[PDB]
């Protein structure tokens, strides 16, 4: 009975400890997955606006030929 009385209380610690563990992990994972996903969305936004900046130059550098002829 004494051996069992210890097994029970150590089982309660192990389970409450592991709840803390899982929670701490599941949180850290979805908080990192969020940071990556948002940074990516911003990266692709900035990407599109920077290819409009080089298309804008291909227009300013297309006219610069037409003018001189």
Partner 1 sequence: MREIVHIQAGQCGNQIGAKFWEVISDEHGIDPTGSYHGDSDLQLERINVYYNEATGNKYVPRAILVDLEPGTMDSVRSGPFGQIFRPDNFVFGQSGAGNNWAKGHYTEGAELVDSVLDVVRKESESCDCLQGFQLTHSLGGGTGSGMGTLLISKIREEYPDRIMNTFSVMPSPKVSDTVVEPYNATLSVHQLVENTDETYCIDNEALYDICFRTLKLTTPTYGDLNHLVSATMSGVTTCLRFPGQLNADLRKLAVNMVPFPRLHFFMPGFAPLTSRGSQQYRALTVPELTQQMFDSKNMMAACDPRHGRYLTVAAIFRGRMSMKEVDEQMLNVQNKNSSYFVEWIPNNVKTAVCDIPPRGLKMSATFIGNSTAIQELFKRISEQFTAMFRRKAFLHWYTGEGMDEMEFTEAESNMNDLVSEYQQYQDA
**CA–CA separation, 55 vs 49, rounded Å?**
10
Instruction: Establish if 18 lies at the interface with partner 1 (CB under 8 A).
Output: no
Of 2 and 66, which has the nearer Cβ to partner 1? 2
Instruction: Establish if 5 lies at the interface with partner 1 (CB under 8 A).
Output: yes
Instruction: Establish if 1 lies at the interface with partner 1 (CB under 8 A).
Output: yes
Instruction: Establish if 3 lies at the interface with partner 1 (CB under 8 A).
Output: no
- Piece of the chain touching partner 1 by CB under 8 A; list 3-11, 20-28, 30-38, 39-47: 3-11
20, 22, 27, 29: CA torsion to nearest 10: 150
Q: What is the largest CA-CA distance in the chain?
A: 103
């Amino acid at each position: 009975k004494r051996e069992h009385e210890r097994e029970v209380i150590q089982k309660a610690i192990e389970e409450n400890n592991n709840f803390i563990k899982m929670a701490k992990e599941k949180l850290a994972q979805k908080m990192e997955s969020n940071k990556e996903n948002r940074e990516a969305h911003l990266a692709a936004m900035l990407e599109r606006l920077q290819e409009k900046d080089k298309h804008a130059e291909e227009v300013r550098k297309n006219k610069e030929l037409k003018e001189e002829a």
